[model samples]
Target: GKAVDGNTLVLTEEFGLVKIKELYEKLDGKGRKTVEGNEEWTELETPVTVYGYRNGRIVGIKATHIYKGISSGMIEIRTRTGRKIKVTPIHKLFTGRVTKDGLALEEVMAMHIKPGDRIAVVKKIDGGEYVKLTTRKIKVPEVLDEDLAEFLGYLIADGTLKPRTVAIYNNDESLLKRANFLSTKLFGINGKIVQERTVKALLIHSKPLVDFFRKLGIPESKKARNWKVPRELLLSPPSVVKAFINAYIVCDGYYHERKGEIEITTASEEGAYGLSYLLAKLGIYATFRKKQIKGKEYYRIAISGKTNLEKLGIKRETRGYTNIDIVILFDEVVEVKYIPEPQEVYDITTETHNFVGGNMPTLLHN
Candidate 1:
């Protein structure tokens, strides 16, 4: 029998953020001048309703650090060491780099670093942290832009991901080109082209960019439910919408040669819903329906008008919590109304407490 849910929490008194410098000054007991009145010298008790990794997954442990998570800032770097590093995107500038401790990182989301360049990178292996003093070269990605939106369209249809890599395969050359170009433009890294006899493909290997994609609700595999559109993309301008639709349909859509109509298919209801919205935004009429194949559910959308069906289109192609610094992560449990309720229920916070959002960390709750 369960007793508590998300809405209910047992808040106990706990020592909160304390400044120690004042404590030593007051307790020294030598002519302290009653600095005892100082609020800084002593500690305060805080009421904590909850704490761990706030994920639909992972129970009981507050995430101290999420290796590649999102933050409201322009960019956040959580090192293998306990460190929370955040860098803001400068709006007026494009294609520039920022420097810290002699290490330079490209700040312009629109720019990328070339391969073979040295990077001072933090590496974590087997739950251990390793810092490569020398540069470790991998493709660096550009900022989120229209290129990202269109590339996502291609990825939704054919992309697959692992811990630090993303790959797409196809039979079309133009798609290959567009995909490769976007991959390079988006993250300054070229895809490894592999034509294993009849296999035409493009592959990218980089953890940061892959993690960036993962942060947007993209999953490791193309299942019926994992496909999603990023919030930023949903609000992008019309050119991006057009590019996304063109690429997305080209990947999984087929033309009805006999019927003179075109249709596209997806298993992700969320992705389908987003696509439909994009269509409506463009003043293009569309219809949606659910169908099952071999007991698997799929969502499909049909276009209102003729879409040009042509060939010759384009081209191409870490589970370890080591350390996170500065930032703190916590989890919450809550109450539910439904019978046979959840093992753990959680609540979202805003006032007084603000840790920020995005997937982050381990119990180090670091």
Candidate 2:
């Protein structure tokens, strides 16, 4: 009410306003931009803080809002078990905000969601929008038929399948040759070899090649941060599962013949977890523990059954051999998605290096 008769009798709506929500295109529901080429509200009655991952860490943030220039279109997924499910996919939506490094909501779903995944719904006895993501059931593909599954194993190990190309780096010319043989017999492309100072990389710059892997449900330029073994192959004939395991071992595995076991080393927790589950599926027992190097966790999954016949020396044969080392490097790009902030007013990096300060992305659940 206008200044209440002037002269500082003012109970005016003060400018002491706190920061506001990043609301754009407000509607009856929460703002969302869709691939249908338009903005819309969410299935939720209003805005919600979606609980998911970010920068390889889990964080909760409101999805696509504010910036409405474009939209993330519909996402379609085929449950691997349904076999021909992709002919008619489950239509889902992708939130525009990139939640992690090279991972969006869609990518996470692609990497993790499998058939028979489930979610629970609960209405509050007291009304308020509060979310707790505790029972995050993994619905990643529990099944995928033979060959592709094996291919995935290799891909997980050393196959770098990006949106346009697929490459595998190895020091052995023989293995590279064998991979190329499969390249034409399977992927129908004569793979090219780019010899580096140290090793040869069987790299194929083919959209068709990438599309081939994509059709098999591998994410474009997929990352192993949360890799998996196809559920189909897990329950498949032992030969199939072993083939997948072998391919993975071929990519980056080492056997402990002295101990009669094998270790699948991986940077992605998914690779470790998947190998553990897959080994179990193969009537094998595995022991997994994190080996810390420079404070970053690297997973080592060990199985009791087999070993790859070809290791360069004590190097490939025994990972920890006293006289063994072969290093093949890739100048390949490490792609990370964009992340917005919770708009913290007081924030600073804890480190001198490029770091996000303030541990604000802390979790409510352990």
Candidate 3:
């Protein structure tokens, strides 16, 4: 039996009537009352509209409760120890009873999650307050580059300058001067003067240079006596000499004045001749010649690599002459001059090709 809005009573046996009060009581006992009495149920007040039952018998009630306003947002969570965890929505949720245990809405992205990640969730609430949720696991990125550089600086603080055995000049004065020159050019600061006593001071004072050598694995305990000196000053191995020259030449706006009159010894002559032979391999006009005057013989080489003889259609006779130096033609004669004796410089300036040396063979194709 049921009573209508104004006390109109009705009894239905065939329909198997069940009271609405009984259904509400049953749902409340099962802990479904909160969900059933939500805003959705309030929108539909009558039993017929809300549950769709006829004669108080449950027929077709609204089965699905769709949750709106669920979208993606970024969440930043920080712990008391200053550890930060950044999370974003879109992580997967576990189903069933896990939802009742607050396991559904994850604040962290799946990729950022790790085993035993100590992280708390920050949720936005009313009045601009951020409420912290339960903690979970998360993965953090590695330490940054700036932090690593600072650590390296700390480690190298007590490191000493590496000992350099190979000294440049003959005396300690020369060595100190060279060191000061090198330090000034490299670090933009002049070091201690070139003297026997100051050489030790220069090496000791140049901290940056010491660090530079240390980084290259050279140690400071190495003895100067054990250092090997080369036989000839300029005649070093190609790599060693080139490295030394490159350090100065590559520097911008750096020019050193040419020193005293050039002197050519027997060793210098051999080196010059060797360099000339090397240059001739690349197409350049060059040759060495020896001439007999009375009982004495004199040797001299001509470099025409700079001579623009090709433009005049005159390829000079270069056969039978030993290839001495390689030359290239620019605006004027540019010879890489090399001689053995200081007297040879005077001879070269005064003597012509035919009188001072022998004739060069003609360049004719056989």
Candidate 4:
């Protein structure tokens, strides 16, 4: 039976994070292809290796068969921490529950998964490798060093890239100096610092620099409003992630003095989502909100729970479940919606009969 939508995100061994439809198109003619289920299932010629949760740990499993189907209707499930997936009504998902013996993960159909149900979410995943550029040649960091990581983070927060120029905006002289030094150290260009009435900007004029950022998936058109965290950075090492987070906080983050709440604001909707997802990988659960200020809409990612803030060392000894667990965490289902229209659906069969899928990456059956 058809399961997930085409846009479902899957973790793979060869391609890191990819959309299932994209993966299907990439492996279209690798083996003996066949059509079944009234041409709904297009079996791939070869199988792909993907990451899945089994026996309370992450394991590499083979997806033996893939299918593309036309679904009669679709169900969208959203979790408390902003994870979502769209699937056919018949799709099976693993729901965590208490049983007579102990805790159990039961396979429940999408239509049957109601609000307040808990779904399986992996605490951590193995970081993915950097992707190489194919169309054009540009200078990229040989290794993800501290300077490069921090620079990328700051750029995503307060920097700008358009046409043949790269710039980072800040009023603090020391912060601008740090940005300027990193520009010269990593990209071999000395950026000029320009001061205006209300701000100072470190500007570098380099085409290669612009292309380099594009290689990391940063788009040029309206980047300030739609920038997203690079998938490579999300899969980076812990130290590298820490440096990136620190620099990003220095740019667009806010710390409330009295309430002690932590938040990061961005105009990019995808940026807010990707940042929250990246934070979750490090064991922090954040809530995403849409804030309207001065008649303009922006995305705000906020951390409120004691255990969530404690994971960032903001509070101490709260004794709550940490998001960064060795095995899995159960997230409350916040919403479920049904779309009464025919839509394209996709599914995969793994050796273990299950794999993680969606932005939140919940366990699912074949």
lDDT of 1 by residue, 1-366 (tens): 101122121111111111112222222332222222211111212212222223322112221111111122232223221122222221111111234655343322201222222212111001101111111254443344557767887887777778877777787867878798887766677677677566577777888767767776678865447666554454455456666787788788887777755688787875665564455334343555678977999877766443222211232111111222222212111111123322322222212221211111212101
Model 4 compared with the native: what TM-score? 0.82
For residues 288-335, what per-residue lDDT tens digits would candidate 3 score against the true structure? Answer: 444454665533333332331221122435641344222211111112
Ranked candidates (lDDT, high to low): 4, 1, 2, 3
Q: What is the lDDT of candidate 1?
A: 0.42
Candidate 2 TM-score over all chains jointly: 0.43
Runs in model 3 deviating more than 4 A are 1-175, 194-201, 223-366
Between candidates 3 and 4, which one is better according to lDDT? Answer: 4
The collision pairs in model 4 are 31-45
The C-alpha TM-scores of every prediction are: 0.45, 0.43, 0.19, 0.82
Poorest stretch of ten by lDDT in candidate 3: 343-352
Off by over 4 Å in 1: 1-143, 195-199, 221-224, 306-366
Q: Model 2: residues >4 Å from true position, as ranges?
A: 1-147, 305-366
* Per-prediction CA RMSD (Å): 21.7, 21.3, 42.3, 4.1
Report, for every candidate in turn, its global Cα lDDT versus the true structure.
Answer: 0.42, 0.39, 0.24, 0.74
| Alpha-carbon shift of residue 292 in model 2 (angstroms) | 0.4
